[PDB]
Design a protein around this ligand. Sequence first.
Ligand SMILES: *[C@@H]1O[C@H](CO)[C@@H](O[C@@H]2O[C@H](CO)[C@@H](O[C@@H]3O[C@H](CO)[C@@H](O)[C@H](O)[C@@H]3O)[C@H](O)[C@H]2NC(C)=O)[C@H](O)[C@H]1NC(C)=O
Ligand SMILES: *[C@@H]1O[C@H](CO)[C@@H](O[C@@H]2O[C@H](CO)[C@@H](O)[C@H](O)[C@H]2NC(C)=O)[C@H](O)[C@H]1NC(C)=O
Ligand SMILES: O=C(c1ccccc1)c1ccc2n1CC[C@H]2C(=O)O
Ligand SMILES: *[C@@H]1O[C@H](CO)[C@@H](O)[C@H](O)[C@H]1NC(C)=O
Ligand SMILES: [Fe+3]
Ligand SMILES: [Zn+2]
Ligand SMILES: [Zn+2]
Lengths: 6, 335
Amino acid sequence: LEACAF
Amino acid sequence: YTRVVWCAVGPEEQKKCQQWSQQSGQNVTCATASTTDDCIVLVLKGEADALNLDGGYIYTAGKCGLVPVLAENRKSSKHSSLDCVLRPTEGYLAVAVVKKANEGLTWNSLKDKKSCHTAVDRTAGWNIPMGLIVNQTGSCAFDEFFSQSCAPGADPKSRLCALCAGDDQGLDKCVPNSKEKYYGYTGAFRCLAEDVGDVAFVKNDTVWENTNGESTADWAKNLKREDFRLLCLDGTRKPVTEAQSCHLAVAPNHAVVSRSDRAAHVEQVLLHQQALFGKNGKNCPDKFCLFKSETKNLLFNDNTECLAKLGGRPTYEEYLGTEYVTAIANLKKCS
Ligand SMILES: *[C@@H]1O[C@H](CO)[C@@H](O[C@@H]2O[C@H](CO)[C@@H](O[C@@H]3O[C@H](CO)[C@@H](O)[C@H](O)[C@@H]3O)[C@H](O)[C@H]2NC(C)=O)[C@H](O)[C@H]1NC(C)=O
Ligand SMILES: *[C@@H]1O[C@H](CO)[C@@H](O[C@@H]2O[C@H](CO)[C@@H](O)[C@H](O)[C@H]2NC(C)=O)[C@H](O)[C@H]1NC(C)=O
Ligand SMILES: O=C(c1ccccc1)c1ccc2n1CC[C@H]2C(=O)O
Ligand SMILES: *[C@@H]1O[C@H](CO)[C@@H](O)[C@H](O)[C@H]1NC(C)=O
Ligand SMILES: [Fe+3]
Ligand SMILES: [Zn+2]
Ligand SMILES: [Zn+2]
């Protein structure tokens, strides 16, 4: 999926 | 009004950053973290402004909203009249390097061999060869492909860290910073030079800069280019003079990223800092050279001639290029 890893 | 806070990854970078800070009269100051991801988080918090990143890390940073500001530009050939700061970047060649004496190792016999990688998540060291290997094997179990590896940033008890050596005390095994003996381009190449690994995933420039007396470091000073071969994707092996026809990918140059709201100030300060400390800089070599660190590529690659302006105010996807971004995305589906 498409989000920031933190 | 305002100082730029650089993020240094590990203590060797922190030391170089501290010399830069002193010489710049605190126009630049330093935060430090143990890994590049932790630096990316310091910037997202606003506790640091910027750092220079491999393309794989630009992907992580860009998914989190950070933007490219200036790119490394190394010595060219064409575009000759153009000033380094205005010349378009050319990419570097990711390659797989082996010893010539390890005869009959090819791209198609890498399974179960020992590999050396710059770190997990970096372009030439990881995203390109592991992306190609997952694709070719039709399997996400890339952690079971090589019998042992050094891939800094992987689980230290796993076989992807089994060849990593840690620091001069033997601590910090596999940490993804320059205190790990086999970290980065020069660490991974050293891992092959010493025959800890059978293959190193690095870039073309690494092999050149650490052979034939181009490096005076103990481990490199006696290496000869002719003792190494590149692995081509068609299964052939070539001399390291042939990287233009025997590479895995062309990578986007390392680049500086920042929060979008500080990108213009970061850019201005960096252009002025490189006029002082850069390749022909007013105070390099007398006082401080921003693009030297005795081959250890600290903060920037030692081969950087300047940080260059980007054309088209690119987004991170535009800067990495659509194809690379899609390859990263595909490989990250495995984990
Ligand atoms: C590993 O395999 C995957 C699956 O094939 C590769 O992903 C694929 O990348 C290609 C080329 O970038 C994409 O192709 C198309 O390019 C045209 C235009 O130039 C564009 O119009 C299309 O939208 C499309 O992107 C393809 O879509 C993409 N496929 C998937 C499933 O995402 C990947 O590049 C391979 N990894 C490596 C390291 O080679
Ligand atoms: C592989 O990398 C090496 C090292 O950067 C490149 O060789 C350098 O290229 C520049 C410009 O062509 C020369 O002026 C330097 O003196 C070379 N350095 C050394 C140590 O030899 C080589 O061109 C690269 N190969 C490819 C195909 O890009
Ligand atoms: O996409 C490429 C490529 C070049 C040759 C062969 C295959 C791919 C590229 C090279 C250099 C660069 N790209 C994308 C933008 C740029 C950079 O530094 O960001
Ligand atoms: C510090 O920054 C200010 C404002 O740009 C400038 O006047 C001064 O020259 C800078 N000095 C150094 C040493 O980087
Ligand atoms: Fe890189
Ligand atoms: Zn190519
Ligand atoms: Zn654009």
